[PDB]
Design an enzyme around this catalytic site. Sequence first.
Site, PDB file in Angstrom:
ATOM      1  NE  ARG A   1      -1.376   8.347   7.588  1.00 53.72           N
ATOM      2  CZ  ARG A   1      -0.521   8.817   8.492  1.00 53.72           C
ATOM      3  NH1 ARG A   1       0.257   9.850   8.197  1.00 53.72           N
ATOM      4  NH2 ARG A   1      -0.441   8.249   9.689  1.00 53.72           N
TER       5      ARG A   1
ATOM      6  CG  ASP B   1       4.118  -0.651  13.981  1.00 54.21           C
ATOM      7  OD1 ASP B   1       4.384  -1.831  14.283  1.00 54.21           O
ATOM      8  OD2 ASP B   1       4.681  -0.060  13.038  1.00 54.21           O
TER       9      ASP B   1
ATOM     10  NE  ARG C   1      -3.547   2.521  -0.051  1.00 56.32           N
ATOM     11  CZ  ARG C   1      -4.480   2.760  -0.972  1.00 56.32           C
ATOM     12  NH1 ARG C   1      -4.777   1.836  -1.875  1.00 56.32           N
ATOM     13  NH2 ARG C   1      -5.114   3.925  -0.992  1.00 56.32           N
TER      14      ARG C   1
ATOM     15  CE  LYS D   1       4.585   2.963  12.015  1.00 58.04           C
ATOM     16  NZ  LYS D   1       5.892   2.252  11.879  1.00 58.04           N
TER      17      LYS D   1
END
Length: 312
Positions: free
Chosen positions: A193, A257, A143, A238
């Site tokens: 995003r 994560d 992705r 993260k």
Amino acid sequence: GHRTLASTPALWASIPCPRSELRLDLVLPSGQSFRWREQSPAHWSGVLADQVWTLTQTEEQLHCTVYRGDKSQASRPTPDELEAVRKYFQLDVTLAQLYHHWGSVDSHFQEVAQKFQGVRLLRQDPIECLFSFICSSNNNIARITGMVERLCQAFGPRLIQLDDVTYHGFPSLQALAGPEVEAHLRKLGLGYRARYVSASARAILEEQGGLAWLQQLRESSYEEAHKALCILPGVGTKVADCICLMALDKPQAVPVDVHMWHIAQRDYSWHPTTSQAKGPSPQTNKELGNFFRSLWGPYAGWAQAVLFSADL
């Protein structure tokens, strides 16, 4: 099209490098960099510092070739170019001593290391790393890889085209700070995003001085670097850890994560103690990160990398 060592050997230069120190197949698609694809068996082609490269290796050598375009005569990489590759893979670091140490304090790592040798941490460019992890979550390599490609093909300079693949450099800060960026990126499929890419680019290009700011975090302490990045839109604990580890030379950084939690539970039966929460949270995630750091040492981040490649 894409070059092959066997097809045009005169265009390849070699870098002394045992397969025990590097495994392209285990590093390039392991989720550190998303700019590489094995366009040909054992040959990985991608973009490195605004230039398309193809890389392949033999038992004791890492062969490299770079594409220069129509403005320059085709020729093997020069000593300096090869040095750029060596820095990218951080070959100055002896993996053997690291694997040895990690294995000496972790039997699980020792068993995993046996089948997964040559896993190292790439030294990526700050801007490329920062915006690659901000443009998309990281739940899936396939992705985020597609999103990074769309990001580059949308605002990245066209480098060259090999076969049916058009390579693009990584977008500059000015390009990402430009108007209509978010809108266009969304139209591409990026999502919400796409807003952080634009916002962060503008925040850096302005309120942070610019590119010099990131290059500085490379020399700042891990504690300063991580805290500084978190001010940027879309940059969380993260993502900041990834950038510190992968681009700001902070090998002790351990991005935590759900993926790392699974590893901790499945392979170490780890459980939180300093926090009441039993699952992922700002408090437990930090404890988890500190658990591996205290376990593996100053290069805890590289050790994580080995486990990630093994888990693919």
